[PDB]
Amino acid sequence: PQYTIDQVAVDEGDAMVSQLTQLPLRPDYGSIWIGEALSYYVDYNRSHRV
Amino acid sequence: ANVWGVRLADSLSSPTIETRTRHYTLHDFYSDLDASVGKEPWRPLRNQR
Incomplete structure (x- = not known):
């Protein structure tokens, strides 16, 4: 659409x-x-935190 | 379970959400009186063999 200058x-x-x-x-x-699954992964790290 | 023949209840379910229905229009009357391929007032049943 294209708008004019009048209004109601x-x-x-x-x-x-x-x-x-x-x-x-x-x-x-x-x-x-649609599509496929999404890679949501995390591995164990030894020296990361606790 | 066994009321007279056995039934497997173990829980019980029911349709909760419900379509409220529309009503008649004469445009729809002409549309489904015209027996289109996509929709038509009959529907066949067949044998299983």
């Missing part, structure tokens, strides 16, 4: 989108996370 109320926008609502339909979900 956000309540007017709410009223028009309530008029034009096609919200209640089921969407396809998908997957939030």
Whole structure:
């Protein structure tokens, strides 16, 4: 989109989108996370700390 | 366990979260009256053999 210089109320926008609502339909979900695992590793060090 | 035939309860589960359902639209009426390949008002059942 490209914005003009005129403006109306956000309540007017709410009223028009309530008029034009096609919200209640089921969407396809998908997957939030693909790929592989992540290398989270630590070894024992003798002289590190205690 | 065995009520009359045995059941394996050991715990019990149930669907907790629930879809609230939508209602009719005539656009959807025409959409599912048009027997598309993706959706159509019937669904076949087949033999297991």
